């Protein structure tokens, strides 16, 4: 199963608070890993939000396939007939879903299986405060290793071969960074009250931005990728873990009663939010579509992955809770 | 015959010296005063950065005052549009607005820490003197405290013998030994009244039926506590900042100098006999002269009657108590 | 993983303990130092770091542009105010120019140059970072001074 | 998901202290800021809370104008929930439940949340222009390339939400890159006889460029009309400076208002023991833009006057145009008062 796979980028426009588990300080700690402690999004939540977006798009009928609009109302009768019109009532009764979502993003609550499995969103660039170069995208060598291991399964052509050259070792008090972050005169850079000596190297950042722009385009989520290169830093594993654990946005919130104009008793709590401008990557595994008299337009796996990439490229979607206060909006750029 | 230095970075000290020599025209008073502070060295080998030594670079005190007031007047149009917007904000709420002229000299924010050792509350953007709303609220509350202590001193002392005993014990704890001297003067009554209004508001329920005559109206203790609010209940009257009318700045100066000449300063500080061998240490400081007209506005959140009562209380306080600094010398007094 | 917060706390504790031990008898010196420490951040935010350092030097009756922190002795002043001003200037400038030490995690933003002379001919970004570091170290120093030192 | 999106512009008439409560630096009580950048922002929670409070006050006072017609919540609730119209009203009388329109727009009150979700979603008040003192042009409005890039991203999000690509490329003709000692400033700020500017601590060489500032002025004019909060927008086109990113961060971190307050005890007339504290305030005359997205209301049996999303868009725009709101703390002492203007594309 799962003949093909695709890579989905995710850029956090606004802080994201996905899910909720030690919760030592934050009453609602972010969706976090266990072995490494990096921020992450469970495949279940990403699959849910993607399938909700697909269902809403199917209702709105803006899922143009091969530069041709996809009308599901005629398609369900064409492929099912008999009770298909009655099946339409099930969509009208909200007890089911349109056939495209049922055959791609999993079945309904009640036989079959989804054509795509949504993996976890692994972190790729973490924004941290810098003394110079106001904020910097920091990574870790094992982050690059995970990226390479994940990306060996899709691209392979020459990009996969050249990506194997990424192999670095960093001490707990050393880093490699661009010209913007390194302080003038002194050969050290300060991020989040941590001082690191710059290690002389001019290949790892170049290759990282090279592959990033290679399968994400020159336009790095609405910004020129060249400007990003000057503000890329790679730190040690422990340093990256500490950054991803303690550099998130801890925001204290309260509830005020209009009767007295003060904070309600027991209404103060701290919520942890994943920082904005955070690059994350997810793997979507697509297999052979379920044999249910599928149209020849998406008969093969290549067609369905193509239509998914086309309909989800440069998209905007909300993840996690706190949607009503402008939290969770991210931009997705499918890897072509 | 004086040497001027500037502790600002290079390529900016030249412009600062041009501004202080009137070669160029500066437009922000706070900018030249604070961020471009000159250090003046007289025959004495010390770069004293004080207004007394700062004024030495001008022909006389009149030239310094004229330069400061010209710098203040150079932003009159911007201050006019700001005051128009402020008046619009006043009228947006159900705010009562009254204008008052300065009977004597006024200085607010003299105790703020600065290089000159004698600062003044100037608006950051426009560089004009103003009275913060916190000062007005505090002076109104203290005038109410003084009125209550003068009128209902013995009554509240008898009602709250426990609180007065607690205050006496605290004073004995801090103010030397003073085991039971603790004179039951008006100051102790004012202190216990403030304690009641601040930490023991609920116990003030019985006193709430009391009434005190202010000006022509009568205000209740419950009215005062509703106006100012407690740790558990928010106040109902919004006190806005006071700003001078832009029209008067065109003709009469809005800022002048004042002098303090502490003879016998070692006697006050160190303990030497006063005598007359105590050559003075003059210190100059800015102050808005008498006659300058300010606009005050108080808004309501629950009842307009409370707004009217607060306006009357604030008018009485500004007429008698006085706002700003050195109020014991008649400074910061307003007339109808 | 050596946070600069540990270096800040250690340096502040060392300097406040040093002034406490050297002038345990002079209570007024302790009070003056505590007051100057808790008022310095306001001066720095108002008039800038260079203006604050020049103000300290002027209160020390010492010329500017020809004096560095290494060539001043805080104990060589009769007046308590001068003592406290010299101690505060020495501590702040030492943290700015050397940090907690050469071998420590933080070695000072300035290599070894006098912070005032550094501010004179450096870019605005460098003096901004120096101001931020001075604010942090002054916060720690004020905390520790309020902790141990007596209050005037 | 969402259907429409409006832009709320907030011009700080008085200093604004959106409290954070996270620790305490030398400047005590810091304002809420974006952690990784340090730029001052107003989180969506506080803005939504104050908007909801103002909307509740307006509805209870019976001052909300819907379709140029006054809205009485009692009769509308009766026409919607006649079976329990009295009981629900009692909950509003006992403050258990918010009035009808606020519960439709901002969601149900805390006493019951599983019924439906809010029909509105406010956004973080990202800073757009910062007031920085200047030698000439008494104070100037300052911006950074990241600020305009985030504005372009916000415009892109609005275009995606509304499926209107025409407005997407409004700002897409502005790419800039400035050194740490360069700026693109208006003619008022530029020093006479010297191609340099002074922004409150720094001498910056005036970089020559006109398209970027003209496009920014045009974008502001389109967003907030021809009246820029009490003064014409064209009257401030010569008082705008685009500076380097680090310089803008330094301005936003160090040029903010620091206000020292004390408590005076009546026993002595002097500041009490530890009665003094410092507070951080956003400077007056600052601009913060936020996105307010709206979709289909999540309630059931809605009145015809608020049936569709556009009926919420127009109501919000008419009820929150050129209004005055209080943000953050120190309301009683005249702090945090801001002029709010609502615009659409």
Curated annotation (Swiss-Prot), chain C:
Keyword annotations of the record: Antiviral defense, Cytoplasm
Cited InterPro entries: AF1862-like_dom_sf, CRISPR-assoc_prot_Cmr5
Keyword Cytoplasm in annotation: yes
Pfam families the record matches: Cas_Cmr5
Predominant localisation class: cytoplasm
Classification via SUPFAM superfamilies: AF1862-like (SSF158568)
Main function: CRISPR (clustered regularly interspaced short palindromic repeat), is an adaptive immune system that provides protection against mobile genetic elements (viruses, transposable elements and conjugative plasmids). CRISPR clusters contain sequences complementary to antecedent mobile elements and target invading nucleic acids. CRISPR clusters are transcribed and processed into CRISPR RNA (crRNA). Part of the Cmr ribonucleoprotein complex.
Family: Belongs to the CRISPR system Cmr5 family.
Protein name: CRISPR system Cmr subunit Cmr5
Upper lineage: Archaea, Methanobacteriati, Methanobacteriota, Archaeoglobi, Archaeoglobales
């Amino acid at each position: 199963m799962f003949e093909k796979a695709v890579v989905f980028g995710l850029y956090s426009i606004t802080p994201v608070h996905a899910g909720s588990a030690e919760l030592s300080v934050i009453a609602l700690p972010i969706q976090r890993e266990r072995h490494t402690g990096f921020p992450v999004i469970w495949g279940q939540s990403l699959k849910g939000v993607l399938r909700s977006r697909f269902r809403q798009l199917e209702l709105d009928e803006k899922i143009e396939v091969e530069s041709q609009k996809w009308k599901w109302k005629e398609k369900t009768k064409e492929v099912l007939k008999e009770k298909a019109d009655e099946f339409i009532k099930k969509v009208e009764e909200r007890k089911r879903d349109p056939l495209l979502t049922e055959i791609v993003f999993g079945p309904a609550t009640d036989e079959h299986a989804g054509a795509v499995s949504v993996g976890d969103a692994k972190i790729l660039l973490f924004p941290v405060r810098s003394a110079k170069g106001v904020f910097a995208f920091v990574t870790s060598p094992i982050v690059i290793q995970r990226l390479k291991e994940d990306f060996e399964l899709v691209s392979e052509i020459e990009l996969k071969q050249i990506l194997s050259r990424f192999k670095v070792e960093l001490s707990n008090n050393e880093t490699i960074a661009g010209n913007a972050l390194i302080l003038n005169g002194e050969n050290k850079v300060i991020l989040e009250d941590i001082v690191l000596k710059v290690k002389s190297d001019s290949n790892v950042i170049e290759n990282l931005v090279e592959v990033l722009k290679t399968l994400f385009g020159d336009n790095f989520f609405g910004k020129p990728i060249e400007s990003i290169k000057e503000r890329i830093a790679i730190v040690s594993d422990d340093v990256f873990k500490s950054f991803t654990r303690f550099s998130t946005e801890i925001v204290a919130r309260v509830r005020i009663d209009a009767e007295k104009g003060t904070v309600a008793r027991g209404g103060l709590w701290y919520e942890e939010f994943l920082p904005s401008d955070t690059l994350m990557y997810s793997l979507i595994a697509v297999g052979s579509p379920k044999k249910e008299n599928l149209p020849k337009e998406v008969d093969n796996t290549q067609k369905i992955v193509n239509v998914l990439k086309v309909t989800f490229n440069n998209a905007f979607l909300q993840i996690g809770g706190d949607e009503t206060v402008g939290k969770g909006f991210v931009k997705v750029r499918a890897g072509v | 015959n004086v040497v001027v230095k500037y502790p600002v970075n290079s390529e900016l000290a030249n412009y600062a010296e041009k501004f202080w020599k009137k070669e160029l025209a500066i437009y922000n008073l706070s900018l030249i005063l604070n961020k471009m502070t000159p250090f003046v060295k007289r025959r004495s080998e010390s770069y004293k950065s004080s207004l007394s030594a700062v004024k030495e670079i001008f022909k006389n005190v009149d030239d310094f005052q004229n330069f400061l007031n010209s710098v203040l007047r150079r932003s009159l149009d911007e201050y006019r549009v700001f005051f128009e917007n402020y008046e619009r904000l006043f009228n947006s709420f159900s705010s009562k607005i009254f204008s008052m002229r300065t009977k004597s000299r006024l200085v607010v924010g003299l105790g703020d820490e600065s290089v000159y050792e004698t600062s003044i509350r100037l608006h950051r953007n426009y560089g004009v003197p103003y009275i913060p709303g916190s000062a007005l609220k505090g002076v109104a509350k203290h005038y109410a405290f003084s009125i209550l202590a003068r009128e209902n001193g013995d009554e509240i002392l008898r009602i709250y013998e426990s609180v007065k005993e607690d205050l006496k014990a605290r004073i004995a704890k801090r103010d030397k030994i003073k085991k039971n001297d603790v004179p039951e003067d008006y100051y102790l009554t004012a202190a216990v009244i403030q304690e009641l209004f601040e930490k023991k508001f609920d116990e003030l329920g019985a006193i709430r039926n009391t009434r005190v005559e202010i000006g022509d109206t009568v205000i209740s203790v419950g009215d005062i506590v509703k106006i100012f609010g407690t740790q558990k209940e928010e106040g109902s009257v919004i006190f806005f900042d006071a700003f001078p009318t832009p029209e008067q700045l065109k003709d009469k100066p809005n800022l002048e100098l004042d002098i303090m000449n502490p003879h016998y300063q070692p006697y006050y500080q160190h303990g030497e006999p006063p005598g007359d061998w105590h050559s003075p240490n003059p210190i100059f400081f800015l102050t808005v002269p008498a006659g300058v007209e300010f606009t005050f506005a108080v808004a309501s959140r629950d009842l307009d009657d409370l707004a009217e009562k607060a306006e009357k209380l604030l008018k009485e306080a500004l007429k008698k108590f006085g706002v700003g600094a050195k109020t014991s010398l008649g400074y910061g007094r307003f007339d109808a | 993983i050596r946070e600069i917060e540990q270096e800040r706390a250690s340096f502040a504790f060392k300097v406040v303990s040093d002034i406490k031990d050297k002038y345990s008898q002079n209570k007024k010196v302790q009070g003056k130092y505590s007051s100057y420490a808790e008022k310095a951040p306001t001066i720095i935010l108002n008039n800038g770091l260079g203006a604050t350092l020049a103000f300290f030097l002027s209160k020390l009756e010492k010329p500017i542009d020809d004096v560095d922190y290494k060539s001043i002795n805080p104990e060589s002043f009769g007046n308590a105010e001068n003592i406290a001003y010299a101690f505060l200037y020495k501590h702040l400038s030492t943290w700015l120019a050397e940090g907690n030490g050469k071998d420590s995690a933080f070695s000072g933003l300035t290599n070894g140059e006098d912070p005032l002379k550094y501010i004179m001919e450096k870019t605005a970004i460098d003096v901004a970072i120096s101001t931020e570091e001075a604010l942090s170290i002054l916060n720690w120093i004020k905390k520790f001074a309020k902790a141990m030192l007596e209050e005037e």
